[PDB]
Nucleic acid binder design. Structure first.
Ligand SMILES: [Mg+2]
Ligand SMILES: [Mg+2]
Ligand SMILES: [Mg+2]
Ligand SMILES: [Mg+2]
Ligand SMILES: [Mg+2]
Ligand SMILES: [Mg+2]
Ligand SMILES: [Mg+2]
Ligand SMILES: [Mg+2]
Ligand SMILES: [Mg+2]
Ligand SMILES: [Mg+2]
Ligand SMILES: [Mg+2]
Ligand SMILES: [Mg+2]
Ligand SMILES: [Mg+2]
Ligand SMILES: [Mg+2]
Ligand SMILES: [Mg+2]
Ligand SMILES: [Mg+2]
Ligand SMILES: [Mg+2]
Ligand SMILES: [Mg+2]
Ligand SMILES: [Mg+2]
Ligand SMILES: [Mg+2]
Ligand SMILES: [Mg+2]
Ligand SMILES: [Mg+2]
Ligand SMILES: [Mg+2]
Ligand SMILES: [Mg+2]
Ligand SMILES: [Mg+2]
Ligand SMILES: [Mg+2]
Ligand SMILES: [Mg+2]
Ligand SMILES: [Mg+2]
Ligand SMILES: [Mg+2]
Ligand SMILES: [Mg+2]
Ligand SMILES: [Mg+2]
Ligand SMILES: [Mg+2]
Ligand SMILES: [Mg+2]
Ligand SMILES: [Mg+2]
Ligand SMILES: [Mg+2]
Ligand SMILES: [Mg+2]
Ligand SMILES: [Mg+2]
Ligand SMILES: [Mg+2]
Ligand SMILES: [Mg+2]
Ligand SMILES: [Mg+2]
Ligand SMILES: [Mg+2]
Ligand SMILES: [Mg+2]
Ligand SMILES: [Mg+2]
Ligand SMILES: [Mg+2]
Ligand SMILES: [Mg+2]
Ligand SMILES: [Mg+2]
Ligand SMILES: [Mg+2]
Ligand SMILES: [Mg+2]
Lengths: 281, 123
RNA sequence: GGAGGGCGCUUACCACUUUGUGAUUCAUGACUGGGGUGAAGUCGUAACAAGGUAACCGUAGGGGAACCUGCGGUUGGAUC
RNA sequence: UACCCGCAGAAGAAGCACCGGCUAACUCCGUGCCAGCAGCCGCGGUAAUACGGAGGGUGCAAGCGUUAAUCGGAAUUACUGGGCGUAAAGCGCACGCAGGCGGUUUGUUAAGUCAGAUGUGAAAUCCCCGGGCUCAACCUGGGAACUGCAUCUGAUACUGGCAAGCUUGAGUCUCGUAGAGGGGGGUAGAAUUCCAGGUGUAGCGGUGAAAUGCGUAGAGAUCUGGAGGAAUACCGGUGGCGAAGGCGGCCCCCUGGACGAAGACUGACGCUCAGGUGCGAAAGCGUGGGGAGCAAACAGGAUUAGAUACCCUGGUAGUCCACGCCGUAAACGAUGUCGACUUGGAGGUUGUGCCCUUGAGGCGUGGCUUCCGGAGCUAACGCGUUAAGUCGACCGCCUGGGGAGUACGGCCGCAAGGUUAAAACUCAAAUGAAUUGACGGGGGCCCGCACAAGCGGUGGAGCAUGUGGUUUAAUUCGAUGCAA
RNA sequence: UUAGCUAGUAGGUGGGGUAACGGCUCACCUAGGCGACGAUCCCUAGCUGGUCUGAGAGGAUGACCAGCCACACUGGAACUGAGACACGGUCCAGACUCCUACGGGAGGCAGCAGUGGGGAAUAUUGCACAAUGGGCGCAAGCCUGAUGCAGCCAUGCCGCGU
């Protein structure tokens, strides 16, 4: 069966070997080719998988420039002294030393306007999850200072795919002295949403999973047996310009959300991010 | 071509393709509509046309055009479709007669009464 | 009584079938691709008419987007 | 029943389309990018001859519109009868079979062609001349036509076949000259860099600022010597050579094409082409080497709320070489080849002669190449004795702009891909050349405090209810560069 | 954008068959036949005398009149007969429509009317054998949805009237 089965790695290695497309975990890509086996012509398999690397799922190709991030980390952590008069004074210094690292791309940066008002307004409806997960943790792993400002102390483990960005932000465990009660591990969710947790932080999920297929969003929440979540999106409508082209991360919910165990709890729309609260029975 | 190049390959004329995809050697065609909705005509124009889809009997679903200051059609009724050429509506190349079959026509009209099935009032 | 005829009997081709096996063909199609037009992104700007701008052909490598780089070629050539 | 006669009686019998420019033929109201026509260009925001309605006019009539099919229009399928530099159009460039086509003198044959005759091409209809239903339509007599095909009988200008000759197109050969024409060996010099001595040590390379690399195990720079690899400066001009692509060091061997020139011989062995064969830069690939520089990916240093665009520092393929495959370009001279005809002048290169080469030149005879220009040709720019002019022979490509030089089905490959080559849909265009003008991160031309300069001011955290901030005891209010 | 097709296919002899010449049907022998002057296959379409468009050359079309071929529920095959492998003959297989006491049988409007369905659309379950034509008969006569007519729709041409 080499026609189809020895012709999956000839395709798959090529992506995961090239240093330009190597920003991914081996299992993540082992999945996305068995999915797309019968998707594009048998002489155009790797050829049109590059379409899912440029037209779709792109900018993660080449990656987020970790060799520009540490370039703005080593140039950042060595700027001001370390006033650590006590043990929570190592955190308040670690607070601003971390704040700017989520502010190179204008996405987790539109999230830093919610570091004081919307990192505790979420605990009133899920509890204080001590079994937690996270999808798309590109530049959102320093939310712990504010997640534990309320008392989230359980396992927060965000799963990104860019390894040149995850390892440019995972070295921080001791270099930056990030809290020692938190793990991080790689993983996608357009491929791997299986497990059980309590809170499912969806930050950069957006409609990138609804780009892998047309109308296939309600699948993941369920796969990861759960209770609640938090799901936000950009609301950068320029005085009635991005209307329609940006108001669909919602109307694909309320409409499709009649019939199963999924429900909704609350909804807001402030700053540049509109968070969703979800429920199941 | 030279004279010798004509005895081997003759002059291949065009296929004489008309502006309608199919006609079944028939001028008009009867169909049945499915949904009633309104779309947008083109960038310069700014009007609301009766762009309704009428499914035929040969398995073809072609969208025609319904003209008039107000028709009263029903989802499950016969609709006669004739020929026509319209540019302001992309994808549309057919019309719809009125005053015949299960379709009604306008009233209180004198000029251009030969179409839309208008009748002659007794003056 | 024979000749021979006829019925039966039976061999030949041969339509209808029937089991496998391919070609062409046909209608929907479970799994789908990209185009397409509606749309629509207060982008000249990561380079704010100074953070100092040729166009294209063939080919190869990088093609979140028209590109950009290597090699060779052409005039059909922003200020100049 | 046709036809004919009599009585009453203008009594029962005219609608529809169009009404901007095509394409003959208009006023107002309602509505105000809203509601509506539609074939093309389009029309519709308090004045619509483009909508609806009233009136009027025009077309036409027992019929007026719309729609569908074919043809003319459409020279928009060109044998009659158009192009191929720039609009969509000549294959990257040649050798050639089956085809097409092929000069001159004489003779034969009579297939093609031409003429005459016979047979035949059934009727209606088309065509011409007449008659008959009151007339017309319809029907009918006679004649003609059916462009075609075949047989017999003739003529012999051209074509073709057979036989016999000539030379004006010229093949080949003898005697010469010019060339980076192509390929296989060898040799020389300069320069970069690496590998060895002597001498000389915190600087070197490199970017308008910074840094990485390279250095105290002898860097950079300089001299000498050696190894390896690649390219041939000045000479070098759009010169020469080849069908095209392409190739510039002296230089050995092998060998091809083109051209000049006084004399012989052989007597159109001639032009062109599908399929096929061969050649075809660079890039890329397979099987083996070389590898000093440069240089696609990749990564160090800059840089910025992101330069894998450009700058700087290195390097794996590749470039080089032997043996193969693929056959892709602005492979452009945007021009297929061959032959013939055609007012001329002014610059190079390369042969053979005359003349006093005594003034190293005039006056003749060829090939190749550049520029200008008249007639003529073409929309225009231009070409214009190398044709894109005037004739002829042969072949290829293109029938609107996108989709698309794509997909599928064959062929050609170990790959990357190429060749032959669509059907739907979308749109009223698209593309070209000459103008008029705007404009340009404007310079050669050009006038003025155009920026100054030379006796002097305005510019005052006060105020003149005219006034550049807070003001509702400001707002019942003007006007915002002696260019609002 | 279908490149080779064909082993009773090509050719000679003999035998046999048909009203006649023939691999139409066999044996034997032979290795040829066709084909870029387009073999086969696929798709589509009746042809001709004409009509329509055009000044012609052409293109398109094949209805009505007429010549010829093919077909007769769907396949195959055969007999009677001078001429047919037979449209209202027959036998048989399959499908469909009926009858029946479950052994089973019969029939064909792609004839004129008419019905159901499909389709933007095309007729009356009519009259007469007077003439014409055909079959039978010595003649007379009869048969003849062929023909000759009527009714219906302005489909087209032409004329007249309002
Ligand atoms: Mg062009
Ligand atoms: Mg009108
Ligand atoms: Mg009009
Ligand atoms: Mg009007
Ligand atoms: Mg024509
Ligand atoms: Mg020009
Ligand atoms: Mg070619
Ligand atoms: Mg020849
Ligand atoms: Mg003759
Ligand atoms: Mg004759
Ligand atoms: Mg008369
Ligand atoms: Mg006559
Ligand atoms: Mg006659
Ligand atoms: Mg003679
Ligand atoms: Mg000849
Ligand atoms: Mg002769
Ligand atoms: Mg001769
Ligand atoms: Mg040489
Ligand atoms: Mg030294
Ligand atoms: Mg020292
Ligand atoms: Mg030296
Ligand atoms: Mg070396
Ligand atoms: Mg002599
Ligand atoms: Mg001689
Ligand atoms: Mg030739
Ligand atoms: Mg090469
Ligand atoms: Mg090559
Ligand atoms: Mg190689
Ligand atoms: Mg060239
Ligand atoms: Mg060309
Ligand atoms: Mg030359
Ligand atoms: Mg000239
Ligand atoms: Mg020309
Ligand atoms: Mg086209
Ligand atoms: Mg088109
Ligand atoms: Mg002056
Ligand atoms: Mg006021
Ligand atoms: Mg025989
Ligand atoms: Mg004509
Ligand atoms: Mg005529
Ligand atoms: Mg004619
Ligand atoms: Mg008929
Ligand atoms: Mg018999
Ligand atoms: Mg019958
Ligand atoms: Mg039947
Ligand atoms: Mg019906
Ligand atoms: Mg009789
Ligand atoms: Mg009648």
């Amino acid at each position: 069966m080499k026609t189809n089965d020895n012709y999956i790695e000839e395709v798959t290695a090529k992506v995961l070997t090239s240093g330009k497309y190597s920003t991914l975990y081996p299992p993540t890509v082992r999945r996305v080719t068995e999915r797309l086996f019968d998707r594009y012509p048998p002489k155009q398999l790797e050829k049109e998988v590059r379409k899912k690397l440029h037209q779709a799922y792109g900018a993660y190709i080449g990656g987020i420039d970790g060799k520009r991030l540490e370039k703005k980390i080593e140039k950042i952590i060595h700027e001001i002294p370390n006033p650590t008069t006590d043990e929570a004074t190592r955190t308040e210094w670690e607070k601003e030393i971390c704040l700017k690292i989520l502010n190179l791309h204008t996405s987790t940066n539109e999230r830093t306007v919610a570091y004081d008002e919307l990192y505790q307004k979420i605990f009133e409806v899920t509890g204080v999850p001590t079994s937690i997960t996270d999808a798309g943790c590109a530049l959102n792993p320093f939310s712990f200072p504010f997640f534990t400002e309320a008392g989230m102390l359980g396992q927060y483990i965000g799963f990104d795919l860019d390894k040149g960005m995850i390892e440019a932000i995972e070295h921080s465990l001791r270099t930056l002295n990030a809290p020692e009660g938190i793990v991080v591990k790689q993983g996608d969710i357009l491929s791997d949403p299986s497990g059980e947790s309590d809170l499912l932080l969806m930050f950069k999920l957006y409609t990138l999973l609804d780009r892998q297929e047309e109308a296939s969003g309600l699948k993941i929440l369920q796969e990861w047996k759960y209770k609640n979540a938090v799901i936000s999106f950009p609301i950068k409508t320029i005085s009635g310009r991005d209307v329609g082209m940006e108001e669909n991360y919602t109307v694909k919910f309320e409409n499709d959300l009649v019939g199963s165990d999924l429900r909704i709890m609350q909804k807001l729309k402030l700053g540049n991010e509109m968070y969703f609260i979800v429920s199941r029975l | 071509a030279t004279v010798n190049q004509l005895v081997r390959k003759p002059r291949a004329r065009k296929v004489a393709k008309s502006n309608v995809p199919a006609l079944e050697a028939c001028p008009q065609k009867r169909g049945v509509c499915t949904r009633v909705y309104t779309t947008t005509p083109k960038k310069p124009n700014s009007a609301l046309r009766k762009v309704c889809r009428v499914r035929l009997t040969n398995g073809f679903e072609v969208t025609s055009y319904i003209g008039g200051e107000g028709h009263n059609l029903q989802e499950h009724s016969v609709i006669l479709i004739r020929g026509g050429r319209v540019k302001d509506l992309p994808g549309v190349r057919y019309h719809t007669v009125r005053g015949a079959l299960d379709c009604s026509g306008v009233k209180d009209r004198k000029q251009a009464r030969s179409k839309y099935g208008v009748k002659r009032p007794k003056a």
